[PDB]
Design a protein around this ligand. Sequence first.
Ligand SMILES: [Cl-]
Ligand SMILES: [Cl-]
Ligand SMILES: [Co+2]
Ligand SMILES: [Co+2]
Lengths: 439, 439
Amino acid sequence: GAMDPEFTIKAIKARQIYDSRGNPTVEVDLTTELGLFRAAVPSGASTGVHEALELRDNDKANYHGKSVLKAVGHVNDTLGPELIKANLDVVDQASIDNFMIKLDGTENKSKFGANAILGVSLAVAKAGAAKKGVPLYKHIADLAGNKEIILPVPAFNVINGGSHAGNKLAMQEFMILPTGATSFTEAMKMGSEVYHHLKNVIKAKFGLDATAVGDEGGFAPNIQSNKEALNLISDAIAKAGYTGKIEIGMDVAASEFYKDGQYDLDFKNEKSDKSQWLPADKLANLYQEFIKDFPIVSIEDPFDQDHWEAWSNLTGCTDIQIVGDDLTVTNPKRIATAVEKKACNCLLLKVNQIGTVTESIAAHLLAKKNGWGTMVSHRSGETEDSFIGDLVVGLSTGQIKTGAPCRSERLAKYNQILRIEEEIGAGVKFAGKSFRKPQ
Amino acid sequence: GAMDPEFTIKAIKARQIYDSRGNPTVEVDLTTELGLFRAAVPSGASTGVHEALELRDNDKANYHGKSVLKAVGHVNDTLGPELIKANLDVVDQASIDNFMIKLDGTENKSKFGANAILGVSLAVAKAGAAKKGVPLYKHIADLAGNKEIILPVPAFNVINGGSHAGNKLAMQEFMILPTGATSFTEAMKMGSEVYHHLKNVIKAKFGLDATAVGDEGGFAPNIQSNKEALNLISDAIAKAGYTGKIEIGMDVAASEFYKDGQYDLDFKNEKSDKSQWLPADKLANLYQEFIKDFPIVSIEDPFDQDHWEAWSNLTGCTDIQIVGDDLTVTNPKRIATAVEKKACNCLLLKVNQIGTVTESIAAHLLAKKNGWGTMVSHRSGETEDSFIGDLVVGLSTGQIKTGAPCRSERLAKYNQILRIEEEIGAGVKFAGKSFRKPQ
Ligand SMILES: [Cl-]
Ligand SMILES: [Cl-]
Ligand SMILES: [Co+2]
Ligand SMILES: [Co+2]
């Protein structure tokens, strides 16, 4: 039978679990002499085009093509056994990640799947922290050269539109940021109180059934305009008692209504008035109008993912945060292009878009070195995993978006940051108004 | 400073976290020489009346009265320190639970809170399993005298009504049970596939916004009748390809439309036709009609929580499972009454309704000794905790309801049972058609 090779990693075991939308995803158990370290992989709602490849089975006869048994098989049959034989120090995240990258041998991780590779990468990072004898977020901070831990402002999904709701609302998501809180504990209290006030307002105006939630845990009532959505959020902030301590973020996902070089803010109405479509300059004016009227501090994907001119123009006129998501796709080649063009000033960090801890940190540090902020992000398909809680604390980016304070694939992350806050103790720092650049 | 007393428990630390509805709840870390053991407490949507007391702060100025800092304080200031000093063997769950019960010194755990006591109780059980060197579910099986582990049929919430939705639907919830699956893995596949087919049907008939989810992860479209809801589920099962392998459970929550000794199936219409209200005999006939027309195998709370005659009558005519929830409230005094009256034949097990592992197992064994089944249950406010996954496996009750396959406070439990299935290995047993009495 088996013989123990006395390698640094004792076992690596992948399995199929279910994500928060009820679809299979990958989980990895990595065992060392110090114990078992478990991590699971999130999944986005759709294909990126520039992302590292998420490997699905495409077996039409089972799970409607969405099982991840091939990815799981790659970990158990090849990636895991070869990494174990490599006998690498589990604290050297970079060597292990680069070994995996080279073993896969493709640019987009299309041999094993980014979902096979990332699950190991994340579990390795936990094993390395245990070997160091420090919490995961301190290990991540070391991997990033970060000398001061600072907790993030949470960015809570509250209102949804775009292709993710049947309302008229064109813009995809609206978020609240308690930048005026004095601690992460108080930020969570403020977000949860505003969220419940918003629920009460929606119930009163739209009815009880209008308070069911989407994938992120927020609401999608039958709102007609983006202005109405901002008004609704402002009313909820005012009823909650936090006007002036809550600011607003938007994720426009403008690629989804980019048609014939213009933008269609009524793209869910099939009889849309094509004379009402906005050129990028007119759309930038609308954003600027919302910024004057509402405490909007961050706008994500304001233009199409390849509309570099419009991005550069807007990022140059405004002084708020402009976040690349579909623009940058956690991809250093795209980030380098965005840096050169000054197209945005904040990177959305989705670790499973690139597929290792090491590359994720590198992408963050590339953004940071060029003066950008970083907003750590969930995916729409999440799990009970809380890694990105430690990640945003360890990188001290000052900002994470990982759901409404509703649905425990979202609260798992916020709860983990509360645990970290308690562990750090008195003197723990909270980014607050400096969320774009905490240090 | 501190001095180590060399007691069996090294530390006990409670904290406030957020549940899946965005409300505070209790989490407890218990540390022994073998590590840290963490557990969190669920919370029901409303007050029971017969439940052990969930202690809330009722500070109107913070969290709208729902923080649990007093309960957290009881663990950290009194319950924890006294349990540690008691120096009890962590594998003796009963001694530790009974010590806590006696320390609180009240019938309903109203001094510390059932939410203070349960968090410790659950963490103790994990520490005891580690001391034994066995998985939690094997330790629980030992605590219960269970000699054969058998995995449960999951009961997935799919359709919601009653006071929990704005539809006309009077009955509170409809569930699918893949009793025809041959393994827990296949049961999860079947449930998730049917769930997604149901989503597609609802989107086609009611629109995309009708597919937002409630607390459990299921749907609440504008259904007019209970028959329509059953038809909708049957259509989804048929489109998924599993007719004959999926059965249906109901939770009527009939207490909520018990008015003037009758039952009002249109209780959400303020102009309800009082001549259409059903006496218990007529309501029992309606259930019997649904049982003839649909594969209904389980009905929970078919009558008011104190309507003993109607319960006894229905449980005597029918041969399907009749589940006490509001009737029994995981309370042995109520269970003894239900046993004597033959009012039901299945106990819904909600550990936080009674407040310790030991009392929960006793309530289960009381039901089992009298020929009842046991269905382990989530609460509407859940966490990323997965204890009740191990609990239903360890007791081998054959059935757990812990959500739709949607929202990770629900998938956390199903995922944990998948992990257990993998750990047991080949030959793992699945209750299947014997879910009411696996052994
Ligand atoms: Cl996003
Ligand atoms: Cl229930
Ligand atoms: Co969305
Ligand atoms: Co409900």
